[PDB]
Symmetry: D2
């Protein structure tokens, strides 16, 4: 609404003794439109280079609006669909052309789907958008000459491989590191917030999925500029884990490696870790060595990037999420505020106009028998009129959001699959890290009561 930190589960900032931050996308903000466009290009490129896809793909035009965050795709049928909170298909596309409610139903023999079925891709990653947009064009081309390109599920895997390789390959980090200004966006409020929480005995640490050599470059560029004379960015973090292999870092058991800030060389760890630079590791050992409880640790990330059930049951420490798209969602809803009120009132006028439609319709066969024959036919059109207006209003309201997929947190009336992932995974969430740091490091974040249908409100 009009706040900065949205709460899902209670969390006392006074009890938190350490805060973990995902360097990329959480601690260091990026230009979503550019970063995505870059990955899309690199991947679109590598495909026709190491997989020899048809050259036509080289001429694929990227459109950022072609996809929205939180979409799910099934590599089997080469489809992309917006799922509801319970897996119900709100709207689907095969490639780029929408699928009729009819064809969808006949295809999935149900309005629901089974995310347990690995044939679907429901993981929240920082490259979903690009992936979705590309995969869409990549299936259209496939439908044309299906003999030249692999199968729908094959393409999906290939794209995933490229997206993956380009990330560990070095291709991506290089293009950006040599353009820190087109891709990364800075803000002093972040360095100020960190300093604020530090002044409260709170120890900050970061865990990235990038090499130290590269991390030292981004951090320096994105932080140093805002420090005072004599200060160093490395004095902001008590710990910094590089090539953390984030997903598994939380629930796995991969070993740590002490990193020499100077050379960059490393040596195996033979005891409890201590303030400094490390590589790899796992949350279990980290929490242990620091002599604290998981509930005394809060980690903030940009994308779930994994299975919520295992992440929450196997890790044990508090988790928050920063959702960038939240900026546009809130903005669009505020913009549609007036249109919302209009459908609302138009609705009430249709509700009582219908409430009376039955009152005199039941009476027509509950006490009498044929008397209002023309009476009902009067409200029957008087309702088809107001309902026609509501149709148009709902249409205007759509113009305020992504025309192809509507809003991110909504799957029609109910919340979207992504809205559910956030609710389950993050106890707290906001548009950008800065919002959280803006508050008092000793704030007690409470949640608003849900209130069930059978509950009485006061």
């Amino acid at each position: 609404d009009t706040h900065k930190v949205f709460v899902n589960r209670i969390i006392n900032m006074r009890k938190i003794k350490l805060i973990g931050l995902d360097m990329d996308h959480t601690l260091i903000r990026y230009n979503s439109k550019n970063f995505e466009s870059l990955v899309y290009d690199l991947v679109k490129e590598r495909l026709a280079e190491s997989f020899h896809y048809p050259e036509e793909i080289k001429k694929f035009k990227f459109n950022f609006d072609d996809a929205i965050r939180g979409l799910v795709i099934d590599s089997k049928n080469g489809n992309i669909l917006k799922l509801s909170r319970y897996g119900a298909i709100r709207l689907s596309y095969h490639g780029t052309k929408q699928i009729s409610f009819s064809d969808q139903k006949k295809i999935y023999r149900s309005i629901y789907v089974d995310l347990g079925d690995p044939n679907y891709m429901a993981i929240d990653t920082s490259f979903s958008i690009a992936f979705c947009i590309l995969y869409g064009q990549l299936v259209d081309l496939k439908d044309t000459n299906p003999d030249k390109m692999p199968s729908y599920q094959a393409i999906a895997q290939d794209v995933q491989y490229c997206v993956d390789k380009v990330h560990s390959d070095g291709t991506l980090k290089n293009i950006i590191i040599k353009n820190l200004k087109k891709y990364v966006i800075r803000e002093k409020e972040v360095v100020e917030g960190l300093k604020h929480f530090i002044r409260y005995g709170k120890k900050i640490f970061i865990l990235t999925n990038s090499e130290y050599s590269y991390s030292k470059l981004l951090l320096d560029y994105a932080l140093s500029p805002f420090l005072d004379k004599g200060e160093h960015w490395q004095g902001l973090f008590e710990f910094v884990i590089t090539l953390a292999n984030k997903p598994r870092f939380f629930y796995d058991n991969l070993r740590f490696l002490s990193v020499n800030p100077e050379n960059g060389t490393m040596t195996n760890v033979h005891g409890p870790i201590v303030p400094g630079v490390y590589q790899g590791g796992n949350a279990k050992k980290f929490t242990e060595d620091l002599g604290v409880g998981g509930d005394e640790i809060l980690y903030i990330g940009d994308h779930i990037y994994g299975d919520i059930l295992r992440l929450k049951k196997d890790c044990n420490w508090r988790t928050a999420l920063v959702v960038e798209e939240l900026g546009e969602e809130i903005a669009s809803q505020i913009r549609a505020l007036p249109i919302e009120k209009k459908i609302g009132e138009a609705m009430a006028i249709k509700k009582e106009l219908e409430q009376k439609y039955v009152d005199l319709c039941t009476r027509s066969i509950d006490e009498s028998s044929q008397q209002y024959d023309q009476e009902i036919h009067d409200l029957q059109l008087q309702i088809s009129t107001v309902d026609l207006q509501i149709s148009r209003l709902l249409q205007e309201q759509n113009s305020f959001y992504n025309p192809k997929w509507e809003r991110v947190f909504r799957a029609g009336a109910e919340e979207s699959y992504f809205a559910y992932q956030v609710d389950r995974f993050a106890c707290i969430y906001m548009e950008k890290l800065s919002d959280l740091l803006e508050h008092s490091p000793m704030t007690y974040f409470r949640a608003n009561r849900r209130l069930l249908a059978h509950d009485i409100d006061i």
Copy 2:
């Protein structure tokens, strides 16, 4: 709240052409306290009869309040626990003695659990309460002399077998059929409601898990009394499926059997079914033969009794649920209405009293440095006072609910696991079938908008 039908998903009663009713517990109401007590006795009996459990169990006193609906038990550790909407253990018991947050955490190595792990029993059945209460006493005895009784998971299976046998055995149906007055509770409103929906071209049908011979006895006793001269209860239902094997009836493919209302004898079906009595069957064939769409069929039951995912994805027709316990929940909340307001106001007084605690606490080290040393120590006690009151108030509020497990739909602040099952499984739910029939058979049930944390309310 102050309504009869609670809505979870939109459903237009004008589009529904057929309504299915679960005979036992939905169409025919029972005395939960008695019916449960009976099953508990029969099962407690059969155990020491076919399994030779220690005679001590014969002296087990049944207490209806020892369990609440929607609990989950893990046969492995012989524990019973109240799970939240996302599997977090709100409170657990090993046998009958509560488990400390500490011991729970060390036992489950997490505050969450994996319902996918078959070692847990999370199915909503009409015998859960009794089962829970018995299983509890059955583990206490086990802990005493663990050499005489099977393992925790063994006991669980045994109990399930007895509960099952006693149901198909005939033991249960007989005790009740010979006491239709101690166990079953009647109400003319039901027969009136049925007649009402029938007068609107709506075809009602029922599917029970009992033999016809027995069904004809309950129906006659529970319905006939309220009909007019010349009327027969069999004229209320277009179809009646006996020994439907409910769970699988919806998603399986078991074949139908035409039943002769007179003899009770049967013959295989060799074509589309037609109005009358049948046995077994499956929803797929039933929907087909009637030439209608699944969405044009509404089935109302008393307990989910199965896996929600498969039931909803594999069946396809609308489903509502009647939750009896809802009567006491609403009643208790209304009773605690005044106490609720008190913690509420006591909270606001603690909120701003804390809001100012930081305002002058941060200032103590944000602009100054040691000046309000005694100032803060004044509000620190003034807050420990109001918080102490809130503690007592929350205590009084508990007295209004089941002392051992709190409310059914709540797992602390958030909804309970059962509240989630209802939300996902039923588009509509109410305390008793009668509530639904009280409305207009051409009612359009709409749901209230959820509203997310980041949503702005008008």
Copy 3:
């Protein structure tokens, strides 16, 4: 070899008190070539009738040799492949055109596959052959105009549905019942064998997946003719279960129904079953009521028709299998007996010719250094000659078996996936039921010792 009953696990016929027989294909033999051709036609027909597949399929010519028993198909890629004992792909086909070792490897990223992956169909049914042959042609047509036909996995499901419907539909049973002479093959030895085992206190019972009305027709035609005056076929069986729903009949819990031999009408069972006609049921209750142990019951079937693990762990009574194709396998091996000896000797001649190739090859660099340069080049061709002969011989040996898939029990040198299913599922197996009855009903079937590689033979 030269025996009738092949043993996999020890079984004492003196301990067996009851023998169960699968009516179709086990007790009553059929003309595999015709029965398959019929199903193929019916299914090929229904598709273009209820699914509207392209009319071209109506002109599909059936070839019985296009498939062999025990093949596996993956509905995903529309492929059919012959798996080894451990899931290694011995040879694969996409539609009808073989796949190169190279393309196979790149497609499955391994020479093995995961039968746990439901995308594969590895169930041994009595319609696999036809299904395979049709599915092959059904994918070829698909590749031509992929826009008109469903997806590879869709087609597979459709075919399965038709194969299924045509079986419960009545279409199949009717064509045959009106041609018992073109489809069914009789033999008095069966009626004599039954009478023989009966004379030894052994109770025979049958469980079919067909209606009684139809069973009474086949049994009468296939048995009565061989009885003596005053005898009746119904006097051969102590029990006869109809519409047994075989697969689940063994491990499920479906209830029994007493069947009136005259009318055909039925009534629910309210106690232990007794000699006579029943419908449905489950092995658990059957074994119980008869007061015997599972190990005292032997069931003989024609196809595994299910999951071996569950069938063997959840059922508990002895199981044998009758494999019709065994007739041609043995026949072909005997026919290739002489060719086998030739590759064998040609092998020994290549073995020692190679044994000496290294002896003088290692010596060329183990004690000396370049001396037999031309010496080795002499045996190098003398080996490429004998190896060329062996190549041709192996070629001649193939002509003795199915040219497209080789033998049923072999996947190259090692046994085939099907050979493994038989080994695990049946303790005893033979070409036809008659073979078993030919032996003494009090025979003790022993198995030959396996003998491991590191074992010393005497």
Copy 4:
């Protein structure tokens, strides 16, 4: 038998361009009796130290014969059992006291088990024996005072944790490194064999799960002594991977780290790996960088140590296994050679003595009717006599093997679960690595034909 290398699947040593060796237990032999005893002690110790188990365990006497390789234990019931090739329980123990066939059957409701059920531990590790022996004593103590020790499955996990910690802790490696003579056993034949294969263009590499610092110590001690002047052990290996994290090393994607042989420090890899010391890694990248095919790589290990299906389907390169216990198995069978012949002949004498028992038994009711009443009663005792002898002989034969669990590769008549794991996982296997190196590095290992029951032998 009388050979050194036992073959399961064909493998041409001429095609193999690289051979991987597991350093511990494969390349460097150990004193199984001592190494196990050590682990048992360390683990028995750590338990009462970090888990505070009852001090009584400190007095537990280790017995090496209490367990045999290839056993399976189910943490749930705290049982240890010897499974057959298909999961059938040949013999089980709850703690230390055997379980009757009767109690076993009632406990597992079947003679089979489901290894897919994670409640079982079926992984072949180098610490199974010790683990089994300890776990047994650890459940006996539990049964005494079940209130002091965790649950059966808890204990199992604890033991696994200690076994694991003690391995990564350093506790184990230290005790041994300071006693390389009590634990490790050397043999020059190994260094000679390596040199032999190297002289044939074959590149050897090793991958251990230990740190380099420690590896350099064992290798030097176990190899250097056998080299010629000027030679170094590091000249025997083209590659050496340390802390390979073996299990996942084959199918995972963990990254490599170049290791500085001198300092021991490391640096991330930014290109194809090259001859030298590395840490971590994965088979996929390794095979790629070397520009060879998986089938051109052979890895020899001491224990499967993982899931065979994933290891074989996800890795792709050839695998052999060295089974130490094979030394005693072969030895014992040779020792029982004469006793074997005796039961064999005693069997034949019982076979024909039974063959004639039926011949004159059937005749007693196949042509006559009561005539040999006393005749049969003569052979009935003459058979109970020879069968009594066979009973004693089988008894003498057992004395030649582990009295508690019989042989490792046998589960009664058929092969054991472990025999199956070897057959499926290793294409080749032998008692010790040395055996393989004794052969010509350009040997073509062929397998003996299996031969099915219905096969005719020449």
